[PDB]
Amino acid sequence: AAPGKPTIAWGNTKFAIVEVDQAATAYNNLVKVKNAADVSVSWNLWNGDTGTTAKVLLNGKEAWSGPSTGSSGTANFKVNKGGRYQMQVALCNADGCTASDATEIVVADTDGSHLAPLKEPLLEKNKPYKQNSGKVVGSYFVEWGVYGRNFTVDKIPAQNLTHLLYGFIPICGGNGINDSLKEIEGSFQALQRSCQGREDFKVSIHDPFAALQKAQKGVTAWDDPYKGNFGQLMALKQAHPDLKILPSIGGWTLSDPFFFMGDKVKRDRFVGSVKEFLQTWKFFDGVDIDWEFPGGKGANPNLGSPQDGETYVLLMKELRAMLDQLSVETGRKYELTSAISAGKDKIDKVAYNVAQNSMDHIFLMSFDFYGAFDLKNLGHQTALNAPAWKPDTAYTTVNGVNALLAQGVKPGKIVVGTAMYGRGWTGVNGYQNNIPFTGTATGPVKGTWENGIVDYRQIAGQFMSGEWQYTYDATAEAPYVFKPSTGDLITFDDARSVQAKGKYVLDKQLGGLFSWEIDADNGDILNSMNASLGNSAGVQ
Numbered sequence: 001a002a003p004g005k006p007t008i009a010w011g012n013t014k015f016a017i018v019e020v021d022q023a024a025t026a027y028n029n030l031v032k033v034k035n036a037a038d039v040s041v042s043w044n045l046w047n048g049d050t051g052t053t054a055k056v057l058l059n060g061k062e063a064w065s066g067p068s069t070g071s072s073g074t075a076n077f078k079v080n081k082g083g084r085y086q087m088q089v090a091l092c093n094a095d096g097c098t099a100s101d102a103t104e105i106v107v108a109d110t111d112g113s114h115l116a117p118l119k120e121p122l123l124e125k126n127k128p129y130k131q132n133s134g135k136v137v138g139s140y141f142v143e144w145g146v147y148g149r150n151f152t153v154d155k156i157p158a159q160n161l162t163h164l165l166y167g168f169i170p171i172c173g174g175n176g177i178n179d180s181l182k183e184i185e186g187s188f189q190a191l192q193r194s195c196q197g198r199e200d201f202k203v204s205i206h207d208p209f210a211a212l213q214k215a216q217k218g219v220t221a222w223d224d225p226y227k228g229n230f231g232q233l234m235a236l237k238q239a240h241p242d243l244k245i246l247p248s249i250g251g252w253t254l255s256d257p258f259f260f261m262g263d264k265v266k267r268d269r270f271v272g273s274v275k276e277f278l279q280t281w282k283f284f285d286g287v288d289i290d291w292e293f294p295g296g297k298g299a300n301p302n303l304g305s306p307q308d309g310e311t312y313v314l315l316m317k318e319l320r321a322m323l324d325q326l327s328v329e330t331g332r333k334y335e336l337t338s339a340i341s342a343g344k345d346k347i348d349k350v351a352y353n354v355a356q357n358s359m360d361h362i363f364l365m366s367f368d369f370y371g372a373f374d375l376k377n378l379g380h381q382t383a384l385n386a387p388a389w390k391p392d393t394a395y396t397t398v399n400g401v402n403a404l405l406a407q408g409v410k411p412g413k414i415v416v417g418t419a420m421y422g423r424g425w426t427g428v429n430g431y432q433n434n435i436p437f438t439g440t441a442t443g444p445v446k447g448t449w450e451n452g453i454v455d456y457r458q459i460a461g462q463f464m465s466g467e468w469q470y471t472y473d474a475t476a477e478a479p480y481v482f483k484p485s486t487g488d489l490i491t492f493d494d495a496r497s498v499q500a501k502g503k504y505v506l507d508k509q510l511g512g513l514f515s516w517e518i519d520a521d522n523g524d525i526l527n528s529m530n531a532s533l534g535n536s537a538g539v540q
């Protein structure tokens with residue numbers, strides 16, 4: 001007779017292809033990429049003949065087989081593809097094979113293949129749009145927003161984006177390499193811990209706890225291998241297979257390393273580390289470079305060189321070459337983007353007409369034109385146009401686009417920036433004709449998280465009532481609120497100014513819109529980005 005039916009032994013059923021060491025703070029130790037997951041299964045036979053061959057089946061296919069030599073056994077084998085498998089043990093002899101009931105096993109991988117889709121309800125004022133315009137609709141999500149701001153990946157209105165950018169992935173380096181981090185409490189230290197035993201100029205993760213280990217919706221079980229932002233973004237990729245999720249390298253405080261990359265030894269180490277990072281974290285779809293900025297005038301007053309232009313173009317060509325190689329190794333399309341200053345003085349430090357040939361999209365940072373960093377020369381921080389009172393205003397969106405176009409950049413490469421925050425001042429005074437932007441200020445407005453900056457959610461929720469004036473400047477295409485008694489003045493984008501930008505994009509055949517930062521919106525901004533670019537209301 002055929003063998004008795006085996007009983008699969010109770011035991012761990014969760015395994016990983018990319019292992020995460022749960023007691024490691026250094027990135028080098030934290031993640032271990034294997035070719036295949038080591039799986040184990042054991043069984044007992046409570047009734048009958050044990051057969052002469054035991055096999056482990058996944059979905060009916062043999063993953064292991066050996067002699068059946070007693071009433072219990074164990075099998076250790078490798079599984080090289082992520083997913084959920086119905087595993088059975090079968091005992092066979094010449095008279096037949098008898099299979100156990102199936103037990104699911106979970107084989108983890110960083111494409112999110114082991115994960116349920118994370119497909120969460122729209123919150124706040126967000127309404128559903130179809131991505132059918134062909135235009136970019138992007139936004140940044142910040143790794144540290146999961147603490148105070150309490151804004152997690154399950155809160156992103158992901159159906160309403162084409163591009164989700166993760167700020168920010170750091171470049172390893174201590175003294176003289178990331179000095180701009182020292183201005184943020186404990187930040188520089190944290191990077192040194194992550195980067196322990198790791199070369200400088202290779203990428204790492206800045207907060208491995210937030211990125212990989214914090215409990216979050218859908219990844220809360222102790223043995224879920226990937227938690228935090230990365231585990232949720234993997235599950236988001238399962239829900240939104242066409243969303244481009246890009247790691248963004250740099251930003252205001254993590255850009256110092258780029259200034260060293262005129263040394264091709266360092267640039268090549270960087271590029272190679274980016275390749276390794278995308279082979280490790282397969283849910284990411286390319287890389288965004290946010291170097292602030294070639295030529296200097298970024299956070300560090302001691303960096304910047306006339307060579308930075310050339311280094312930027314070389315870097316993009318070499319990133320593109322590495323992504324094209326990754327793309328054909330994998331069958332995937334990988335994207336290369338960059339967030340750039342919109343100031344013409346910074347634009348013309350780079351030959352974007354040359355670098356565009358390597359880049360899918362240019363994220364024009366058409367915001368921060370004005371703010372509490374300059375208490376004397378006030379103006380709209382994210383306007384499309386100059387205002388009536390100063391038609392020669394240098395920093396406007398249109399001027400940054402036109403600088404790019406005047407170099408020879410193709411319009412379709414250019415994605416226009418919209419602000420999900422305001423900047424502002426207090427104590428504004430000495431202004432004429434009821435236009436507060438003609439005065440000067442005494443300090444920063446009281447921000448939501450930091451001085452001088454206010455989430456749009458808070459502008460809409462608190463500063464559109466009581467004593468606050470609200471004015472839409474139709475020349476500049478820009479809203480502002482002003483509290484006369486405290487001279488508090490805030491310049492921000494609203495649904496109407498966003499709709500202007502979006503019509504301007506369609507009229508000038510630009511690439512789309514993107515925003516900073518997704519946590520600060522209540523829905524009104526991203527709704528308008530979508531509507532204004534022609535995306536159909538509704539759900540695919």
Ligand SMILES: CC(=O)N[C@@H]1[C@@H](O)[C@H](O[C@@H]2O[C@H](CO)[C@@H](O[C@@H]3O[C@H](CO)[C@@H](O[C@@H]4O[C@H](CO)[C@@H](O[C@@H]5O[C@H](CO)[C@@H](O[C@@H]6O[C@H](CO)[C@@H](O[C@@H]7O[C@H](CO)[C@@H](O)[C@H](O)[C@H]7NC(C)=O)[C@H](O)[C@H]6NC(C)=O)[C@H](O)[C@H]5NC(C)=O)[C@H](O)[C@H]4NC(C)=O)[C@H](O)[C@H]3NC(C)=O)[C@H](O)[C@H]2NC(C)=O)[C@@H](CO)O[C@H]1O
Pocket residue numbers: 140144145147148149168184187190207209210250251252253254290292339340341342343346365367368369370373395421449450453516517
């Ligand atoms: C025309 C012209 O040329 N004009 C120029 C202006 O351009 C120029 O001003 C600059 O303009 C550029 C653009 O041209 C801006 O850059 C781009 O866009 C954004 C701006 O529009 C930039 O955004 C900024 O991004 C930086 C990131 O580098 C943000 O810094 C982050 O700040 C927060 C505080 O708010 C820090 O938050 C803390 O994070 C830690 C994590 O380690 C958390 O710690 C956790 O705490 C919990 C307890 O609650 C604890 O339990 C956990 O254990 C603990 N975690 C750990 C790991 O231990 C804290 O909780 C957390 N606190 C908060 C509040 O959340 C965060 O760490 C810090 N990040 C880093 C990595 O440093 C900054 O806030 C962003 N600003 C805005 C606008 O929001 C972006 O960099 C860049 N990219 C893109 C695509 O946008 C520049 O911002 C701008 N600079 C200035 C100075 O404004 C001016 C020059 O002044 O000049 C004109 O001429």
